């Protein structure tokens, strides 16, 4: 039975982990302004997330099927972020006014970087009809969203159209959304909400987006360029610049023993976990 | 079932009513559906 670890997060067979620090999976994948360190992330062996990360969804709201997304993320080793719809491709909509004080960047109000908050321009919101075609030989992780406004006055002040929708359509996805305009509590100073959605686009499919308001449009998607045997690890331990073949959320294991009592959750070639304090096999006879 | 059509022109070409619903009700079932008219990719040659 092995009972000792180095107490550090270390490399797994040469590949350094993705330590999200005080960011979450949603904050990294949506582009929180406090998470600009993870804009271009190399190939990782496992992802480290804290138990209660401070920088998540800066603007209050939700990420639909967030735990299913993290379960999918535990089988991906590398992403390639690509601009699928440029921010300069919106000539009839406002792309620079879509900022929030709930999403600060060095004091100034800002927004998620991988999606754009589209606002009416010249007191008009034309119907967005946008299609992207996947021509990249890899599956694409595409994230979009819907803003839920507070009142009808805000709804006309942001989008000019009182009753709006967002329709999304792929070979397997058929989504229709409407904003839920209602009074809510202030989270991060904002009573409004933002519901985010994700999909996987196959390498010869299209996503059709059509909306006349409240649309948080995708700008950046993620090519899944490498897959297989990752994990998401809840750990506050610091990265110690090591190499190891077995990692647990409290440290790395350097052992040829068949058992350990360190932590049930492990990654790599590891001993079998048992909740025992002593496991000693007598090999010789008894002593006088 | 419920058919989801592609555009308002096809919706009027098939049923002539632009805004439709399906309500189903039993002792335990209370269902209200509306079509999701949207552009989608072709599966088996059909966008609907």
């Amino acid at each position, epitope marked *: 039975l092995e009972k000792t670890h180095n107490g550090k997060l270390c490399d797994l067979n040469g590949v350094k982990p993705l330590i999200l620090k005080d960011c979450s999976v949603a904050g990294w994948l949506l582009g929180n302004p406090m998470c600009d360190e993870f804009i271009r992330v190399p190939e990782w062996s496992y992802i480290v997330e804290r138990a209660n990360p401070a920088n998540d969804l800066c603007y209050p709201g939700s990420l639909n099927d967030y735990e299913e997304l993290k379960h999918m993320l535990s089988r991906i080793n590398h992403f390639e972020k690509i601009q699928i*719809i440029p921010k300069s*491709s919106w000539p*009839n909509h406002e792309t620079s006014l879509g900022v929030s004080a709930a999403c600060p960047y060095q004091g100034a109000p800002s927004f998620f970087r991988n999606v754009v908050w589209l606002i009416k321009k010249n007191d008009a919101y034309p119907t967005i*009809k946008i*299609s992207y075609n996947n021509t990249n030989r890899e599956d694409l992780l595409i994230l979009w969203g819907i803003h839920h406004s507070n009142n009808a006055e805000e709804q006309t002040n942001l989008y000019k159209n009182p009753i709006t929708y967002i329709s999304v359509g792929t070979s397997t996805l058929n989504q229709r959304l409407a904003p839920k305009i209602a009074t809510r509590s202030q989270v991060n100073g904002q009573r409004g909400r933002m519901d985010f959605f994700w999909t996987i686009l196959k390498p010869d499919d299209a996503i*059709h987006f059509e909306s006349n308001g409240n649309f948080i449009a995708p700008e950046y998607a993620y090519k899944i360029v490498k897959k297989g045997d990752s994990t998401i690890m809840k750990s506050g331990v610091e990265y110690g610049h090591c190499n190891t073949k077995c990692q647990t959320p409290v440290g790395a294991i350097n052992s040829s023993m068949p058992f350990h009592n360190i932590h049930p959750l492990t990654i790599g070639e590891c001993p079998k976990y048992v909740k025992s304090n002593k496991l000693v096999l007598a090999t010789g006879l008894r002593n006088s | 079932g419920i058919h989801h059509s592609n555009n308002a022109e096809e919706q009027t070409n098939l049923y002539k009513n632009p805004i439709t619903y399906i309500s189903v009700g039993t002792s335990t079932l209370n269902q209200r559906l509306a079509p999701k008219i949207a552009t989608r990719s072709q599966v088996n040659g059909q966008r609907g």
Partner: antibody
Amino acid sequence: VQLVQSGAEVKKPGESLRISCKGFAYSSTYFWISWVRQMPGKGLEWMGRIDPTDSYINYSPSFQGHVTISVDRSISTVYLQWSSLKASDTAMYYCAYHRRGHFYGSGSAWDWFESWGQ
Amino acid sequence: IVLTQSPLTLSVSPGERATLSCRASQSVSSNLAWYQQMPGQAPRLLIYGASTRATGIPARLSGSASGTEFTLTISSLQSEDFAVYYCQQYNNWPYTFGQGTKLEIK
């Protein structure tokens, strides 16, 4: 698609003119029909675009107040209109089919003119 | 966006190689097309995306992009290559064309 336009027109200044373009169906995929003016000897100038499905029009700043682009959704035909013609309006006029808001690859826009009418 | 084409006329013998240049005023980020036009006919697409040939276009038509500059190369010039060539950007609207380039038989 295959675009067919109306015949040639000879008019005097001060008259109103309506040329047409047809040959597009109710294409489910979002699409634009554009009008292009080409003066004899000169290059091409884009006048404006219309989506026939919802009658949304984007005008060039050079052609915003001079021409009117409309659509008849019943017969699937896009019209270009002048109210008061001038001598400077003597040019060849094409209608061009392209796609609306489609992208591919790393942000490449797929809205090149894919089909023109004679 | 102003697209300036170079040269305006080019007299090249058939069988040789012709080079057409198109320079933008701003960045169009490879959203540029090359069209060819005969007298009395509508323009027909040759190159989209500043590199990709359309269907039916032979491999002797080459589109290349270097930042703002774009180049169309026609190698082994046949008798049906002597026409007017146009570069059109579709990065933004309004869509703008070049002033043209007439290819003349030498």
